Design a protein around this ligand. Sequence first.
Ligand SMILES: O[C@H](c1cc(C(F)(F)F)nc2c(C(F)(F)F)cccc12)[C@@H]1CCCCN1
Length: 1204
Amino acid sequence: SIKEEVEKELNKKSTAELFRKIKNEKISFFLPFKCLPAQHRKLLFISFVCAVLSGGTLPFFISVFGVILKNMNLGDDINPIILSLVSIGLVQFILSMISSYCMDVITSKILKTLKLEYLRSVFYQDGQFHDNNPGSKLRSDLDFYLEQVSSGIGTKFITIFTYASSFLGLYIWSLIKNARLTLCITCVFPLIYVCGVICNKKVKLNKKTSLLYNNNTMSIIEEALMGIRTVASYCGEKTILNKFNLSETFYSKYILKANFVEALHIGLINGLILVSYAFGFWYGTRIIINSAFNGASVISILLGVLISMFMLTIILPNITEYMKALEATNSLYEIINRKPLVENNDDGETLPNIKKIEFKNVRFHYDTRKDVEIYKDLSFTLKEGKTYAFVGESGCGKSTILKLIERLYDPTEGDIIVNDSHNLKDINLKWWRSKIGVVSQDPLLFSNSIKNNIKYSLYSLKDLEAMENLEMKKEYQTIKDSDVVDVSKKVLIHDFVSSLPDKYDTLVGSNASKLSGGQKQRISIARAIMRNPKILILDEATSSLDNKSEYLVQKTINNLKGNENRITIIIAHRLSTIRYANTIFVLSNRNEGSYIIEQGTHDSLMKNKNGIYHLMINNQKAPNNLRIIYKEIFSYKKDVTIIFFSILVAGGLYPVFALLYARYVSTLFDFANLEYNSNKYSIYILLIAIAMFISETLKNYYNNKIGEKVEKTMKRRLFENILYQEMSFFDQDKNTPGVLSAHINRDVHLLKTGLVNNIVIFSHFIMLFLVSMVMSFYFCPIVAAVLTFIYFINMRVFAVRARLTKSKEIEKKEDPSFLIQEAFYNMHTVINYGLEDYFCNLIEKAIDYKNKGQKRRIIVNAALWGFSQSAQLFINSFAYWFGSFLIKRGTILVDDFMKSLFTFIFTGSYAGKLMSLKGDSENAKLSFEKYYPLMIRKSNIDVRDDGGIRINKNLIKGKVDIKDVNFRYISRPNVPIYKNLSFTCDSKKTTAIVGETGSGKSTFMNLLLRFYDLNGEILLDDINICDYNLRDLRNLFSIVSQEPMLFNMSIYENIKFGREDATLEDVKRVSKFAAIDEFIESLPNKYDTNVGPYGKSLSGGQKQRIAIARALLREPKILLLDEATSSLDSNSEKLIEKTIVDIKDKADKTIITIAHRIASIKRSDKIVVFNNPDRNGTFVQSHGTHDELLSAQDGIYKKYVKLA
Ligand SMILES: O[C@H](c1cc(C(F)(F)F)nc2c(C(F)(F)F)cccc12)[C@@H]1CCCCN1
């Protein structure tokens, strides 16, 4: 979107801001490297030194460059120095390779470790944290941090040192060779950084004010799209567009000012370099002539200084990423360093046996709703060898009971006394959980096999066997299956499993999906049984069973072992499950705390008294698409020629600088008549600078100008088309507001930052390409041919970075992903049993597949990166050798070679610099193809059409006649609504309507304003509605909806909505007649106050009276009311009813109403009611009563006089 882009642009703090931000909080730079062995702590030194060496390369190359040129011009050999490059290049390659390996063996390790540590903390959550940050969010966080640290810690941390070393070569070498020259050169760049700083603020100050005018448009759009119906009826299509257009302009002008300043500064940058070169050569020559020191030594200075100040452009970004990654990890660290509150030691002193588990006034609140206490006087005791039972709903608080028995929530005052001399906190957690069997509402298991799902609890038991006195992987095979076998016959799951083969050898689906729900419950129950359940707890277990499965489970559990000493619980909705019970506790808070209310059994309370249980058992018992765009563009003429000119200049004049540099180099080695040449060339360089500045500036500025004008003219057509569309269009599902605003706010901005930004680049690149390939071959065909062959085959067959990024992205997408996803669903079941079974299993399933792909990826990619760094050296050397080999045998001179070379090189480099500013085009070429039909679609109801009968307000009758209707919504053309409707309203005569609620009453008004065209036969004054030229038809009705809708504009306009030709005095008189101008007169900005969006700064009564006065202004002939006083407070409702009766006293308008206030209905001179006896539709029962037929026959009016 647009807002996100600008927020990203503005919320981009510098390195100084980050430095001051990290200064106070004191993040350790040792933070990412903490879990390292000392092995890696030494290994890291290798890549450190293997970096600094490779960055001490270029100073040598530069200190031999000038001597190559001197040795070449005046006829001598160059062979030794060539070797003194090539060997050096080789060592660079080696070092580069090595460094890669080191990173891709460090990072992964210190990555992987932290993963498990994070994961560990998730399995020591103290219950409440499962509610705080539940599940998937954490995965939406975790992986994010990985991509924020696996892309800011690798090679991009070390390269800077190389560059630093390179800096720390060049300048100081240039400093020892000479002093004054490089100072007089470098004096200028501070004046560049100054301009950059000064221009950034002038960008931002306009950028924000551009946003102050945007969001207003968004509000205008959405606020209008919700209020489509009132806008349609009241004819405010035009006034909105004025607001929209008046808002666009401020935005456009500000953003264009910003773009202008930006292009200006960029041009200045492309200008100053040339003045730098010129003054450099001039001053150097002058001090040579004053000397009587070589000239070649000058050449090696300049480039070096320049390239030095290139490195500062490219160092700084990488740093930020590292720092970014750094703070990211800090977050995760304080997540591992949390302090859960129910953490274990497996060391709490446990007892021999269980007796006297007592409770006293459980007082506990939810963590969020601290001001909502849950239980008040819950107290009881649970002695060994006793059964119990409970009944309730699924939100009363039994979840907290289960969490208390399980030690997940720790109540404040309620005690957990057990055995009368020990606390559950003194007692071990895991010994407590070892002897517990629970089966929740839904069964929850894992996806390996049935027997191993069962043996998980057994593993949890063997843990206690081996811990208090790595055997775990061995003893688990000691556990057998026959227990599961002879208990599987008891739960009657032998036929389903015997049917298909592979009884338990089969692997069951995700969360054991292949079983039925009841069968998964059978297996969960068998698990609970096999784990020595000292207590069995069901949590709405039978809430989703048919009768047979529940009864079989009941027979299974009622006579189950350990009945001498256990606490069996059976919770459910139906009560027959507790037809037998030794004790039943029931509670309620009948609103700040519950407590036990009743006790008893089934028979001794079903027919004993009229308590709660008795009441419950008694009651319940393509081409042209874009050619359109190109047409709209080339209609512009003044701003196409100028971009064309500046393109030609900036393209076909930069290569000239290459040969100009060459012609200076040659004459720099001829001591005679050297001054005149120096002048004659330096001046030309100045002129080139002057031209390039202007050309680039105007290029960028008019580019942005054109894009802006296109967007402005585009949104207008789209919005002005979509506004007038019909209503059934909006009735569709996929015709949503949000999608449409998204189109308007995204696709067009892509259309600017897409097409027009990409076409210019292609034009400029192609121009430079053609001029160079036409220029070089004229001087030296052989060299240019071979060079083009080399770069072609290199970049299109040995494309190193492309293949590298392919490897990175195809690897970044990535079965531990299956297990890790499976875990966070069955969090409950791992808390039931098994914490470190998977802590170690995931490590294995990761490392088994890590290394084999790791070796191939690293051994392939490190060499690619190494060769990527050490190519241009070899190319330049090969070029010089081939050149001299031709020169000495005398086939081509030196100057043609020099010229062709420099042209080719500088143009290639600059085109590489320039291509990295493109934008997205495919998505923009696709969006247009998507939303083009909407800005052309035919509405089928257009007010703009003026072909029909004209009507004048002076001669309106107000008679209506209807015969029959069978209407069917488009949401469901399967069940009709209206059937055989017919009635009348003669003239200035009330007609009150009352029907069954939801009987389609408030759809009839849609038929009148043609919101839904059409079986059905209307007659207004004995002509059908469809030939009245509806432009006028919506200027004499008026509506008072169930809810009004106020717009962000002030009162004076909303009340003037529709009719601008409305003086303030009309507003005053119609307000006093509306009985409203008493609160408004007593406030500043009387007819000027700005309400909020949707009038959220207002009441209901004032809103309604305003909505009514907005209708009264037109003096509409046929008023249409519908239920305007539903649920208002006393005084406003009173004033409103007063105004209604005041209006209805005057029989000057044919009023229609829908109300249920019999005191006002009786005055109605007509009654017509709509019944819906059976679900077929609606039709009339009574007619022509008008209070003369009070209760004479069976109907609904008799009801609405006695019922109502
Ligand atoms: O063309 C220049 C360039 C320089 C140098 C350096 F001077 F460091 F050896 N190496 C470049 C490389 C290289 F592969 F690192 F050699 C590729 C492309 C451009 C390079 C860059 C790219 C934009 C124009 C000025 N800096």
